[PDB]
Design a binder for this molecule. Sequence first.
Ligand SMILES: [Mg+2]
Ligand SMILES: [Mg+2]
Ligand SMILES: [Mg+2]
Lengths: 454, 454, 454
Amino acid sequence: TVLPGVEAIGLGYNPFISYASVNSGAVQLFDWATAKKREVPFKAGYFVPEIVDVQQNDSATYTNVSGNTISEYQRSLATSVAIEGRYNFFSGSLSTDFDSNSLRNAENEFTRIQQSINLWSLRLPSVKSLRELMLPHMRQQLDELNVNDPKAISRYFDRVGSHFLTGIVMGGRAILASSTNKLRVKRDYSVSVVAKASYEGLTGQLSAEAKAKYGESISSFTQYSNTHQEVRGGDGAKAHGVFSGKKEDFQAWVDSVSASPDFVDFVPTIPMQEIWTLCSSEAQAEAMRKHYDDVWAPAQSEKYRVKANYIDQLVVITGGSSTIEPPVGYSKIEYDLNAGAGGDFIYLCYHEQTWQADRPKDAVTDIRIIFNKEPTPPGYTKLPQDLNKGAGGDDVFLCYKTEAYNTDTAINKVTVIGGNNADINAPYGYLKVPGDLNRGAGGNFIYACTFVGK
Amino acid sequence: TVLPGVEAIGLGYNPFISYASVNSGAVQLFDWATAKKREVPFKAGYFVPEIVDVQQNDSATYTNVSGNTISEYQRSLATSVAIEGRYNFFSGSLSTDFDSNSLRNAENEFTRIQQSINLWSLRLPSVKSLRELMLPHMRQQLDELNVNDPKAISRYFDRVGSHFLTGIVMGGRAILASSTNKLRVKRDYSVSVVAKASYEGLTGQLSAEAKAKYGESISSFTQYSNTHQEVRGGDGAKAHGVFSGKKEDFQAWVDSVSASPDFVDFVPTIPMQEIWTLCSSEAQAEAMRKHYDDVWAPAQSEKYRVKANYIDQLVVITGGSSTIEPPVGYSKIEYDLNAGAGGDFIYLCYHEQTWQADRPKDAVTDIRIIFNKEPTPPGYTKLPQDLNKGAGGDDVFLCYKTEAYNTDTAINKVTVIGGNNADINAPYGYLKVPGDLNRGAGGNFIYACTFVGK
Amino acid sequence: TVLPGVEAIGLGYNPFISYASVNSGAVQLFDWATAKKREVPFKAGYFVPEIVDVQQNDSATYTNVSGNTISEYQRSLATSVAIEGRYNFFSGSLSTDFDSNSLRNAENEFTRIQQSINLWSLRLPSVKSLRELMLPHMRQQLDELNVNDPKAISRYFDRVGSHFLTGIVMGGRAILASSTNKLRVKRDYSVSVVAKASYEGLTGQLSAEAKAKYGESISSFTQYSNTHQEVRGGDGAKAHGVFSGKKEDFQAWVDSVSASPDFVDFVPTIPMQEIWTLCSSEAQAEAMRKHYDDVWAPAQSEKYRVKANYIDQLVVITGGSSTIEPPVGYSKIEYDLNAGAGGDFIYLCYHEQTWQADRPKDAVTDIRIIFNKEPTPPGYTKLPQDLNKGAGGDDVFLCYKTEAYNTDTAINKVTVIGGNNADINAPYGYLKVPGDLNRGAGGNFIYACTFVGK
Ligand SMILES: [Mg+2]
Ligand SMILES: [Mg+2]
Ligand SMILES: [Mg+2]
C-alpha cells in the first residue's frame, strides 16, 4: 500500500496555472512502481519510494494573501512561495477565485484566506540520481528535446511544465476569496482582519468576544464584497458543511480529511525544482534555462496581467427630481451638479468599457470645463447641457478628450465632490479639474475628480 | 477492472462541437485492452494503462463564462481552455445552451455557471510512443491519409476529429445557462454575480445572509432571463433533484457522482493534443497542420458565428387610447410620439427579421424625419401618418431607407426617447435622428434612436 | 450478452424517412455475431464487437426545433444534424408530428421539444476494414449493383438506404410537437420558450417560480396549439405516465429507460456515413455519389415539400345581425364591412382549397374594388352584393380574378382591416387593396388585405 501523495510528488508543474493544485501539473515524470519502497515510520502499513523523505506535520495552518489592488495581490500571491523572479506565478487562479468584472473593477481590493489542514508532507531531494528514476519515455523526450528551436522548448514547458514538485503537503484546505469595495467598506480594521474574522465566522471558529468585536465590522465587509468559497480534500459529501456556520459540521469535515487527503500546499523550503535540473547536458540546461527566463516566463507572466476597466463615454442628465436616471447604458454619479444651487437636478453619468485585445476603444483621457462662451478646446467634445440649468449663474459646460486606449492615461474612474470650501480635497489619487460647476450660482462649490490606475 | 474514464481519454475530439462532452469526440484512437495495466494507487482494485497518469483531485469547482454580447461570450468561452487561436471553440454548445431567438436577440447578455464535481483526472503524455498504442486501423487510416487532397484532410478532421483528449477530469457537473435582457435587469450587481447567486439559490448553496443580499437582485434576474438547466454524471434518477432548491437533494446527487462519474471538464494544462502529433511523417504533419489552420478551423469558426436579428419594416399606428396595438406582425415601441402633446396617441412599430443564408431580406439602414413639405429623400420610403396627428404643430413624417442585408449596417434595434430637454441623451451605442417628433407641438421633445450591432 | 444497441449501429438508414428512429433504416449491413467481441468497460457482463467504440454519456438532454413557418421548421430540423446539403432531411416525421391540415395552414408556427434521456452511445469508425464485416449477401448485392442504370441505384437507395448509422445514442426520449396559431398566441415570449415551459409543465419539471412566470403564457399557447405527444424507450406500461403532470410518474419512466433503452438520438460528430463508403470501386462510388445528389436526394427532398392551403372562392353575406353565418362550405372573416356605417351587417367569406397533385383548382390571384358603375375588369368575377347595402354611400362591389394554381401567386389568406385613419396598416406581409369598402358611407375606413406565402 502506497502512501497517499506519492502519485503527486515529482509531478511536472506549471507555476502560473494555479497555486497548490494538481490541475496545474501535466503528468508524472518519475516512475515509483518499480522503485525500491520504504515503510513510512509513523504510518506502518504504508510505503513510499526510498528516495522521498516524508515528515508528519499535522497542523491546521493559515495562508493569507491580500492587496489594495490586483497588481499588489498578484505580487503578494507570487511571493507567498519561495520561487525565483517577479513573474505573476499562480496568477491563473484569479480566473476562478474572483469574478472577471471584479478583477477589472478598480474599486475592489482582494483577500484570499486559506486554512490548510496539514497531515504529512513528502519531500524529494535534488540528488543527481533523480534522472535514473524518470520514466523512460519522459527521459527520452527530455533527452531528444531540440533546444535549437525556441518553439520546441516553449511547447515542452507548455506541454510538460517548467518545474516539478519537490515539496508536497497532503491534507485539506478551505478557502474564502473575496473582493471588496475599498471605497465603501468600514476602515476600522484592515480588510485581511475582517476577511479572516468573517472566514472564522462562516466556519464557526470565531469566538464569542471576537464575534462581538468583529461582528459589526464583518457585516459591512460581507455586504460590500463577493466572497467566493471553495474546499478541497476530505469527504465531498461533508465538504459543503464546512461553511455551514457550525463547528460540528466543520470538524466533521476535518475528521474526514485524515482519510482522504489531497495536495493542498507546498513545503516552504523546497516547493518545486526546475525541469532542466533533470537534463543530462549542461549545454542543454543553459539553452532551456535561457529560454525559460528570456522568453517563456516573461510571456506567461504578461499573459496573466489584468487591465482595469476605463471610462469611454460621459453624459449629463437633467430633470426635476433626485431620482432621475441615466440612459440604460450609463451609470450615474449620485452627486447633484446643482446641489444647494436650486434649479434642475443635474447628474454626470459615464460608461466604463471592458478592455479587449483586438478592438480597444478610445478611453476618455482629459476633461475640462469651458464656461460661458469660450470655444471648445481643440479636439475636445462638449456636452450640450448647461451644468447650471435652472440654477442661474454663468453657463457651465463640461468638455472631454478621447484617445486610443493606453494604460498610462485611460481614465478608470471619475467622481464629483462638493462642499462649502473652494479648496476642497479630492479622494486620494484623484485629480480634480479646475473650475466650479456652480460658478456664479449659489450653493456648494463642485468639482469633477478623475482617477487613473496606470 | 478498468478505472472509469480510460474509455474517454485519448478519444479523438472536435473542439467546436462542444465543451467537455464526449459527444464532441468520434471514436477512440488508442487501444488500451492490449496495453500493459497499472493499478491505481488511490483506488486499489482499479487499473489503468501504464502510459496514463491519474491524479486524484476531489474538488467541487466552478467554471463561469459571461459576456455582454454573444461575440463576447463566444470569446470568453473559447478562452476558458488553453487552446491555440481565436477560433470559436466549443461554440456548438450555443445551439443547446440558449434559445436560438435569444442568441439572435441583441438585448440579451449571456452567462453559463458550471459547478464541476471533480473526482479524479487522467493525463496522457505527449511521448513519441503514443503512435505504438494506436489501434491498427486508426493508425493505418492516418498513415494512408492523402494529404495531397484538402477534401480528404477536411473529411478526416470532420470524421475523426482534429484533436485527441490528453487531459480528463471525471466527475459530475450541474450547469445553469441563462440569457438576460441587459436593458431591463437591475444593474446593482454584475449579472455573473446574480447568475451565480441564483444558481446557488436553486441548488440551496446560497447562505441566509447571501439569500437576503442577493434575494431581491435574483428575482429581477430570474424574471428577465431564460435559465436553461442541465446536469451530468451521477444517478440520473437523482440528477433532477439537484435544482430542487433543497441541499439534501443536491448532496444526494453528489453522493451518487462518486459511483458513476462522467467526463465533465478538462485538465487546464494539457486538455488535448493535435491529431498530427501522431502522424509519422513531418511532411504529413506540415500538410495537416497547414490545412487545419489555413482552411478547416477558419471555416468551422465562421460556421459558428451568429448574426443578430435586424429591423426590416417600420409602421406607425394612431388612435384614441394608450392601449392601441400594432398589426399582428409588428411589435410596438411603447413611447407615445405625442407624449404630453395631446391629440391622438401615436406609436412607432417595427418588424425584426431573422437572418437567412439563402434569402436575406433588406434591412432598414437609415431613418430621417422630413417634416411639413420637403420631398422624400431619394430612395427613402415615407410613412403616411402625421406624427403630430391631433397634436397640432407642424406636420411630421418619418422616412426610412432599406438596403440588402449587411452586418455592418443592418439596424438591429430602434427606440423613441423624449423629455423636457432638447439635448436629451440616447442610450449607450444608440444614435438619435435629428428633428423633434413634436416640432411645433407642445409637450416633450421626442427623438428616434437607432442601434447597429455590427 | 451483447450490449443493447449493437443491433442498431451500422443499420442502413434513410435520412428523409425520419429522425433518430430505427423505422427509418432497412436491415443491418454488418455481421456482428461472427465478429470478435470486446467487453464493455463500464458494463461488465455486456459485450460489443471490437470495432465499435462505446462511450457512456448518461445525460438528460434537450433538442428543440422551431420555425415561424414549415419551410423554416424543415430547415431548422434538417440542420439539427451534421449532414451534407440543403435537402429536407428527417422531413417524413412531419406526417406524424403534425396534423396534415395544420402543416398546410399558413397561420401555424411549429415547435418540437425533445428531451433525450441518454445512457450510452455507440460509435463506428470509417476504417477501410468495415467492408470485411459486411454480411456476405449485403456485400454481394452492393458489389453487383448495376450502377449503369439509375433506376437500380435509385432502387438500392430506396430499398437499402443511402447511409448507414455510425453514431448511436441509446436511451429514452419524450417529445412534444406543437403547431400554434401565430396570429393569436401571446407574443410576450418566443413560442419555443413557452413550448419548452409547457413541456416542462406537462412533465412537472417546471419550477414554482417558472410556473408562475410562464403559467399565464402557457395557457394561451395551450389553447391555440395542437400538442402532439409521444415517448420512446423505457417501460411502455410507464411511458404514458411521463405527461401525467407528476414528477414521480416521469421519474418512474426514467428509472425504466435504463433497463430497456432505444435508439433516440445521433452522436453529433459522426451520425451516419454514406453507403458508397463501402463499395470497393471508386468508379462505382462516383456513379453512386453522382446519382445520390444529382437525382435521388433532390427528388426525395422535393417529395417532402409541403404546399400551403389557398383561397379558391370568395362570397359575401348580408343580414340584420352580427351572428349571420356563411354557407356551410365557407368560413367568415369576422369584421363587418359596414362597421360603424350602420345599415346591414356585411361579411366577406372564403373557401380555402387543399392542394392536390393531379387536380389543382384555380386559386384566387387578384382582388379589386370597382365601386359604382365601372365595368368589371377583364376576366374578373364580381360579387353581386353591394358592400354598403343599407349603409348608403356609393355602391361598392368587390371583384376577384382566379387562375390555375401556382405557389408564386395563389393567395393563401385574406383579411379585412378597418379604423378611423385612411392610412391604416395591414398585418405584416399582407397587401391591402386600394379603395374603401365604406366609401361615401359613415363609420370606419375598411380595406381588404391579401397574403401570399410563396
Ligand atoms: Mg451647477
Ligand atoms: Mg408628435
Ligand atoms: Mg360598407
